[PDB]
Design an enzyme around this catalytic site. Structure first.
Site, short mmCIF file in Angstrom:
data_model
loop_
_atom_site.label_atom_id
_atom_site.label_comp_id
_atom_site.label_asym_id
_atom_site.label_seq_id
_atom_site.Cartn_x
_atom_site.Cartn_y
_atom_site.Cartn_z
CB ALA A 186 -19.91 6.12 10.39
CG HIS A 212 -10.16 15.30 9.31
ND1 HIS A 212 -9.06 15.63 8.54
CD2 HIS A 212 -10.16 16.15 10.34
CE1 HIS A 212 -8.44 16.66 9.09
NE2 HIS A 212 -9.09 17.00 10.18
CB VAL A 227 -8.57 11.61 10.61
CG1 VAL A 227 -8.84 10.50 11.62
CG2 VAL A 227 -8.76 12.98 11.27
CD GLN A 286 -5.95 1.48 8.49
OE1 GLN A 286 -4.91 0.84 8.64
NE2 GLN A 286 -6.04 2.51 7.65
CB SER A 345 -14.87 -2.77 11.13
OG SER A 345 -15.91 -3.37 10.37
CB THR A 346 -13.93 2.10 14.13
OG1 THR A 346 -13.62 2.63 12.84
CG2 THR A 346 -13.07 2.78 15.18
NE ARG A 364 -2.93 -0.45 3.41
CZ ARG A 364 -2.59 -1.40 4.27
NH1 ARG A 364 -2.54 -2.66 3.87
NH2 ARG A 364 -2.31 -1.09 5.52
CE1 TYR A 397 -11.73 6.59 2.99
CE2 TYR A 397 -13.09 6.61 4.96
CZ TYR A 397 -12.02 6.10 4.25
OH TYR A 397 -11.25 5.11 4.80
CE1 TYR A 453 -2.99 3.98 1.06
CE2 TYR A 453 -1.22 3.32 2.52
CZ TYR A 453 -2.54 3.24 2.14
OH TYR A 453 -3.41 2.44 2.83
N1 LIG Z 1 -17.86 4.53 7.88
C1 LIG Z 1 -16.99 4.23 8.84
N2 LIG Z 1 -17.46 3.87 10.06
C2 LIG Z 1 -16.58 3.58 11.02
N3 LIG Z 1 -15.25 3.58 10.97
C3 LIG Z 1 -14.81 3.95 9.76
C4 LIG Z 1 -15.60 4.28 8.67
N4 LIG Z 1 -14.80 4.60 7.58
C5 LIG Z 1 -13.58 4.46 8.02
N5 LIG Z 1 -13.51 4.07 9.33
C6 LIG Z 1 -12.30 3.82 10.11
O1 LIG Z 1 -11.23 4.51 9.50
C7 LIG Z 1 -10.28 3.57 8.97
C8 LIG Z 1 -9.76 4.07 7.64
S1 LIG Z 1 -8.53 5.39 7.78
C9 LIG Z 1 -9.43 6.80 7.09
C10 LIG Z 1 -10.45 7.39 8.04
C11 LIG Z 1 -11.13 8.66 7.52
N6 LIG Z 1 -10.13 9.60 6.96
C12 LIG Z 1 -11.88 9.34 8.67
O2 LIG Z 1 -11.79 10.58 8.76
O3 LIG Z 1 -12.53 8.60 9.43
C13 LIG Z 1 -11.02 2.24 8.91
O4 LIG Z 1 -10.13 1.14 8.97
C14 LIG Z 1 -11.90 2.35 10.16
O5 LIG Z 1 -11.19 2.05 11.35
#
Ligand SMILES: Nc1ncnc2c1ncn2[C@@H]1O[C@H](CSCC[C@H](N)C(=O)O)[C@@H](O)[C@H]1O
Ligand SMILES: Nc1ncnc2c1ncn2[C@@H]1O[C@H](CSCC[C@H](N)C(=O)O)[C@@H](O)[C@H]1O
Lengths: 63, 262, 262, 63
Positions: B207, B94, B97, B166, B234-235, B66, B92, B70
């Site tokens: 979410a 932030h 983040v 992640q 999934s978080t 990856r 998508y 990137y």
């Molecule tokens: N819809 C969602 N609901 C819950 N956790 C999410 C999600 N999309 C991304 N994530 C979390 O974010 C990780 C990707 S890293 C990118 C996150 C994104 N930039 C943000 O601002 O949230 C995923 O492995 C998961 O842990």
């Protein structure tokens, strides 16, 4: 159809509140099919995409 | 040429900032990485000149690190800027983040003497607090990348709300797989058993990406995590294991005590 | 009646979500808690029926517990809902980030059988990541309410970015004062000295509220904190005191080594 | 002032214009010299005084 509805619903607090009150009524009024409505009610996101047409990892933990 | 990185949030169309939406509209070109096709369509209607970063991910059971994906993403973005295009990066949630692409791009753009900045967006974390109705300030907040929490030395405060991002690829060391195994999750469970019991209720959060979609809030004992159904988005939320104990040492220096707490 | 709590972000006008703005527009009544009068005017033009929650704070060097303030805030919001008004609560930043009013209003609303939800917004945290170009997932992230870190037992991870919110009132136990003292902040330094040297560079961060305003990013040694000019909106950033070290214990269980990391 | 800041904050086109030439854009919207000075000096307090509009705390940590 399906795409335009979701887009508008997600932006318009008025329509959103209308949806909350009566999901089926609002959806049927926007011309969503029974199968499209069923998918929404059963929450089968997969089908929704199939009925519409057609990776989210942007980081790692290896330093 | 210039670079503006913005976030669209997790929800379709409605969870992007007003200003961030305006940037996309008047952008010369938009590099996009959105959750689904509904979101991709929405974007294209805002600005037709879109390039999908998704294309740089492994294609056809291909073995690809990856870090290279990137790097290819960043390069593509900078190419537009170097060409003299008012470039907008739309990620998508932030854009800064658990997202290195944006940080890397802005860094490199600046080094080459280009205007580059990042506009804050609504992350999956922001969505979590609201959906679960939890205030991170209530008893504090900790966030770690799941794999980093296993590969490196991190000690969590068991009194805070812990987030392991992640979780789907927890312990995936090669960075070429898009999911891990139950065995890897079991080791993580064992590691977490230092501070958290096995029957400790955790929460798998997801979410919603669609306005008609309900969020995923699956509660289960930590022990069952390895058998749980995980997805990339999934978080893992690990609620406090203990409550807030008083810090007499400092209170004394403050010359106060519990009964004096307002 | 119904309740919807939204965030307006930190920046004026343009940092609110598209959906949240819509909610304010179609609201019967709006309870506001905005940073300044520029944001207040903006809101008023968006929806004239606004009650400012600012009024419930102590007035005229009055001694008033903030517990009562928030209570009066919640009660004012509920009164509208019970009246039958489609009520919107517009708080700055993220409505549920280090904010108890919304969560308290939503909880009480549901208990009384009313429809109440919270829309996520852009918090001072989200802005920090963008302004300082820091990724919370880089080495991890921890957030704590300054005073809570002093009063209760919290163990930070020196490898992560550490945020202390409401640093300006760190040690203010009465909850009647709007600011603390240098002697309190001095004790915080001694406390932090367990994990962070005295010459450890910390950052006083303040996100801008106006589009012509640059953010506050003051770097200084932890030791000089007590003499630093702090404002209510000031957040304290404490970068990592240590770099990530491999966790051989877990790596061994994963049957891999550092060189195996992708 | 209030009218200009609201626009600037929302309009990305105007924003990019502003960052290109702050004083030019501000003068174009009829900001006074003192008002412009306040902006360049980063004196937010004066901006408020000039706008006539002279507790962000919504949380505690005492348990
Ligand atoms: N819809 C969602 N609901 C819950 N956790 C999410 C999600 N999309 C991304 N994530 C979390 O974010 C990780 C990707 S890293 C990118 C996150 C994104 N930039 C943000 O601002 O949230 C995923 O492995 C998961 O842990
Ligand atoms: N403009 C600003 N810049 C930086 N930090 C800020 C800020 N406004 C508020 N804060 C932080 O937030 C604390 C108040 S609690 C309210 C936080 C708000 N809900 C949000 O979304 O940020 C302050 O003590 C400070 O630590």
């Amino acid at each position: 159809g399906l795409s335009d509805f979701f887009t508008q619903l997600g932006q318009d607090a008025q329509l959103m509140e209308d949806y909350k009150q009566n999901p089926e009524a609002v959806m049927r009024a926007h011309g969503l099919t029974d199968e499209q409505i069923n998918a929404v009610m059963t929450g089968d996101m997969e089908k929704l995409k199939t009925l519409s047409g057609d990776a989210l990892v942007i980081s790692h933990g290896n330093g | 040429g210039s670079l503006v990185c913005v976030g669209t949030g997790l929800q379709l169309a409605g969870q992007i900032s007003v200003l961030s939406r305006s940037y996309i509209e008047h952008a010369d070109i938009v590099f996009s990485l959105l959750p689904d096709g509904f979101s991709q369509r929405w974007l294209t209607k805002l600005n037709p000149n879109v390039i999908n970063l998704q294309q740089f991910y492994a294609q056809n059971g291909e073995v690809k690190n990856r870090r290279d994906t990137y790097e290819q993403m960043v390069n593509a973005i900078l190419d537009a800027v170097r060409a003299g295009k008012k470039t907008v990066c739309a990620l998508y949630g932030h854009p800064g983040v658990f997202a290195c692409v944006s940080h890397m791009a802005i860094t490199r753009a600046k080094a080459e003497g280009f205007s580059a900045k990042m506009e804050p967006g609504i992350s999956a974390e922001a969505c979590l607090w609201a959906d679960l109705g939890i205030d991170p300030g209530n008893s504090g907040h900790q966030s770690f990348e799941a794999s980093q929490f296993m590969f490196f030395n991190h000690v969590p405060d068991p009194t805070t709300h812990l987030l392991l991002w992640q979780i789907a690829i927890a312990g995936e060391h090669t960075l070429t797989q898009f999911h891990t195994s139950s065995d890897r999750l079991q080791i993580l469970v064992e590691q977490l058993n230092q501070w958290y019991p096995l029957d400790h209720e955790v929460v798998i959060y997801e979410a919603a990406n669609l306005p008609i979609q309900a969020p995923r809030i699956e509660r289960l004992p930590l022990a069952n995590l390895p058998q749980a159904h995980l997805m990339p988005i999934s978080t893992l939320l690990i609620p406090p294991a203990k409550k807030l104990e008083y810090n007499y040492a400092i209170l004394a220096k403050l010359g106060i005590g519990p009964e004096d707490l307002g």
